[PDB]
Specification:
Chain B: Its cofactor is Mg(2+). Chain B: This is Geranyltranstransferase. Chain B: Belongs to the FPP/GGPP synthase family. Chain B: It holds the Pfam family polyprenyl_synt. 2 copies of one chain form a homodimer. Chain A has 13 helices and 2 strands. By secondary structure, chain A is mainly alpha-helical. Chain A has a two-stranded antiparallel ribbon. In chain A, α1 crosses α4, α2 packs across α6 and α4 runs antiparallel to α6. Chain A has one domain: Orthogonal Bundle (Farnesyl Diphosphate Synthase). The structure holds ibandronate (BFQ) (5 copies) and magnesium ion (9 copies). One magnesium ion (MG) binds next to loops of chain A.
Chain lengths: ~270, ~270
């Protein structure tokens, strides 16, 4: 499809940029940097960089402008996975059939590698060579990423998730959890791409945020459907399917008035379901 | 400078205290862990440095509030992770349960991850850190490079990956030097009066004191400086480091006295 090709292009672009980020400054840091590289260069689909690139092109921006945004979101994503896999959390030996970072290396090294990837995400956005936007915009990007990645966003989601082991969640609570744990970063990816366009305005940003909210949930509902507290458990399988379609429609409706260059976002919304 | 310290401490604690309000109820416990990890009665050396660097260059100290917060937030998150079972495995810090004991291990990992996000948030926030934009960006750049795999986190890995004196110093310069230097650099930037020669002088200062802390702590506890150099020679080196710090400040005006007093204080403990 058009979306499969767009994804492959986004993936190649962000991987080339990311690949350059993992050279140890000196020899004693080689293994730390190898763990960082292992944690990022893992053949991931790069959905968050796709969203950044696509939001940028949806507002008329050349996609290379969003390279730093794309790297930063993926660096936050990657660090999150390394921490999530740790024995204190999900305790997973494998991710996509490969040894998790703490399994490949060791637990200390994985914690640190990921800590350094979070630093690096902020580094790339603050770096005016790598992220050559107007200064006020670089700062806004950093602000939005920090709020999305932190205790009010993604890390908060993780805490909500750990804090409801034992509790039977209803749909509202499930959605609170999801909106933090994954929504915040998906929204930031769209917001930061849009900012990288050089043409953001408040109406277009707010529309793109409605898009991001809808697709972020649509991802979760559809994943649950395909794995068949989950959406099908709550609603039954057919009604979950209906809801996935309702979310796709909300996303497409949010893009009303956008030009043909927003097609990749429209295509993705449909693809998800 | 015990009184200057206590003032820096009260200033930064007031600003930090305001950062730990959970946006909603489901996040209360996370935010409590964050607070517990920061509001721990720490001496706030890094904020003292940021404030004092700012004043050394003629800047009113409140201009450095965000820098002070950011460096302390990085410092605090680093302690939580350093205390974990996979690293130093400490049950206590300053006689109190470590965050992973008071709460739980996942919560401690997460609380600290959110402190690191928050440090960058505070510097990028033009209300809390109201400098010129290019200066905000430069502060963020320097903190990110200092906190990350090329600085502080690198130092942790070097330590775990381990010694002659050169190698000990490589380790220290990453593990603690990078963040001490960033604290001084960020305060200096917050002054609005930074210039390259002064920034370079202040960096020499920070390099010297960072090491002076480590040398003197090893001396007092008697791969340590006394083991490596001999006890009396380590004492000599501590003085040498203090003098390098004071020399780096030669030609700064009287408002740099707090930095001078700290250099002496370190080696007089
Ligand atoms: C540490 C913050 C992570 C926030 C959510 N991540 C996407 C976690 C990764 C997951 O999607 P994954 O299935 O483990 O990949 P989880 O089910 O554990 O939530
Ligand atoms: C080895 C293949 C395992 C399953 C692969 N996907 C389900 C992983 C995607 C995820 O991590 P996510 O939480 O769905 O986004 P999941 O939890 O569904 O697994
Ligand atoms: C990422 C970790 C960087 C932290 C560097 N030090 C401040 C850690 C704390 C120590 O000083 P502490 O004595 O545990 O407080 P350490 O001796 O373990 O280095
Ligand atoms: C295996 C340790 C080699 C690194 C240097 N030290 C001896 C570690 C011990 C410390 O971190 P600790 O706080 O005493 O555990 P120190 O502050 O003495 O450096
Ligand atoms: C780099 C600033 C040093 C400030 C003094 N330290 C807190 C003294 C205590 C130590 O030596 P200790 O291992 O706690 O005894 P640390 O490793 O924490 O530095
Ligand atoms: Mg998980
Ligand atoms: Mg998991
Ligand atoms: Mg999962
Ligand atoms: Mg320790
Ligand atoms: Mg340690
Ligand atoms: Mg200590
Ligand atoms: Mg020491
Ligand atoms: Mg120690
Ligand atoms: Mg010791």
């Amino acid at each position: 499809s058009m979306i499969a090709a767009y994804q492959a292009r986004c993936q190649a672009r962000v991987d080339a940029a990311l690949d350059a980020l993992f050279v140890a400054p000196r020899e004693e840091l080689q293994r730390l940097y190898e763990a960082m590289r292992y944690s990022v260069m893992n053949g991931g689909k790069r959905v968050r960089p796709l969203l950044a690139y696509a939001a940028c092109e949806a507002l008329g921006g050349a996609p290379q402008r969003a390279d730093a945004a794309a790297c930063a979101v993926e660096l936050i994503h990657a660090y999150s996975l390394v921490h999530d896999d740790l024995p204190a959390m999900d305790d997973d030996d494998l991710r996509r059939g490969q040894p998790t970072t703490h399994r490949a290396f060791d637990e200390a090294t994985a914690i640190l590698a990921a800590d350094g990837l979070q630093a690096l995400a902020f580094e790339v956005l603050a770096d005016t060579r790598r992220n050559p936007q107007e200064h006020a915009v670089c700062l806004e990007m950093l602000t939005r990423l920090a709020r999305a990645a932190g205790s009010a966003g993604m890390v908060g989601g993780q805490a909500i998730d750990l804090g409801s082991v034992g509790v039977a969640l209803d749909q509202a609570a499930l959605e609170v959890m999801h909106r933090h744990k994954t929504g915040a970063l998906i929204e930031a990816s769209v917001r930061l791409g849009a900012l990288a366009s050089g043409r953001a305005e408040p109406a277009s940003l707010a529309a793109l945020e409605r898009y991001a909210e809808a697709i972020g949930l649509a991802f979760q509902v559809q994943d649950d459907i395909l794995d068949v507290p989950t959406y099908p458990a709550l609603l039954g399988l057919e009604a979950a399917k209906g809801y996935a379609l309702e979310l796709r429609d909300l996303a497409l409706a949010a893009l009303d008035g956008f030009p043909p260059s927003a097609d990749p976002l429209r295509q993705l919304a449909r693809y998800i379901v």
